[PDB]
Amino acid sequence: ETQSFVVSVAGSDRVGIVHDFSWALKNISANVESSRMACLGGDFAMIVLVSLNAKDGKLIQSALESALPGFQISTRRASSVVSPDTREYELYVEGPDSEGIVEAVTAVLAKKGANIVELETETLPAPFAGFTLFRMGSRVAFPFPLYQEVVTALSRVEEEFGVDIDLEEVV
Amino acid sequence: ETQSFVVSVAGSDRVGIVHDFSWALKNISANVESSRMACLGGDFAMIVLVSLNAKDGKLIQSALESALPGFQISTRRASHVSPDTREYELYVEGPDSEGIVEAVTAVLAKKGANIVELETETLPAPFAGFTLFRMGSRVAFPFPLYQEVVTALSRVEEEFGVDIDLEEVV
The missing domain is CATH 3.30.70.260 (ACT domain)
Structure with a gap:
């Protein structure tokens, strides 16, 4: 066996x-x-x-x-x-780098009970001083009924941290 | 500081x-x-x-x-990586068998290629007697090695009946 x-x-x-x-x-x-x-x-x-x-x-x-x-x-x-209602979603974050982005995004996910399946982050300093680009790409899983409230919570992060966040269901 | x-x-x-x-x-x-x-x-x-x-x-x-x-x-x-280092996407697909990963990675290691990312999966068919193997990898090595790497990987295609693609990253 x-x-x-x-x-x-x-x-x-x-x-x-x-x-x-x-x-x-x-x-x-x-x-x-x-x-x-x-x-x-x-x-x-x-x-x-x-x-x-x-x-x-x-x-x-x-x-x-x-x-x-x-x-x-x-x-x-x-x-x-997991819940049969669990679905996977591709999450993308991009904007100025800061001390708090990663904690802020992952706090949302943890609070809503999302599990992270894949994650990569990178920082890319600009050719000039005073700017570093942050990029995050992730696959996360959570019950689909929570999608809108996750999106709404991620929008607060967008506002507070000046990032663009996309969350798209995997089909 | x-x-x-x-x-x-x-x-x-x-x-x-x-x-x-x-x-x-x-x-x-x-x-x-x-x-x-x-x-x-x-x-x-x-x-x-x-x-x-x-x-x-x-x-x-x-x-x-x-x-x-x-x-x-x-x-x-x-x-530091060399001016002539390039990254490549490596993809392998075919019938699963015990030796595929060892054979592919033997080539890469013998040629001194660095593996940066790697994932493999197996997907059993609904019916008996067949399981698909797939591998996706990003590797890096000096571009002058490209042809000998491809030639070496072609022997793995022959031995295991798998398709292997290796393409420079844009």
Whole structure:
């Protein structure tokens, strides 16, 4: 019987991490069901759903610790256990950078019980002094009846922080 | 006298993690420069570049440990790519099999390409005997390597019966 495991890997970035990881799993006949990997600022992070014909993940954990010495690695059984009215939405924010934008946008999302599925932010200083552009792109999930009140709350953020925010349902 | 710090957070996914993190940073007057998240199977991972007028990350680390009990957190000081470096979108699609990711990544690592973004998925057909594999990635390497990378990836297309596209980013 095939079982699913969730594996997290984090450490300092270098060439060949994904390869070493993949080689190790292939070696133990584990299959990658899905993966998401993010690298930034010299760090590496990846989450993988791994299938194995085995009851626990001790083999996965050991194989990966051997292949990726120094890396922070965890392996656990995949979860058993949202509202059928949950929908996903693409969220985009752009405007002048400031200390409070990220906290302000995410406060709205947290308060309305939205889960963040994907997120990236960047800042791009202008060619001239005194301006840094902030961009955020995100996928979030919440019950669709809350859409209008989320939008209304995000409009306050737009006003207070001078940003443009778009929220569009994924179809 | 503001310096950059790279911060890594990993733990169980739940509502409010990014908010709890960003409030903690705002409270110590630290600014988010950029961030990337991964979320899958109930696990959460995020890397953030943070600006702070500090010589070390002790305040960042402490503030985050307090804001995010149970999470694995690391903070350190952070810092060029060549004129001829280009980024490329790499896409792979075909019947799933155990060796595809290892084969593709073997090529990239042997050629010294950096993987910047990567995601894979498998999509079982409604009927037995078929599962589609898809991979999307952004990679970077010096453009003179392009043809040898493509040639090497063509051997992977042959071995695994997958379609591989590699296109320079605009």
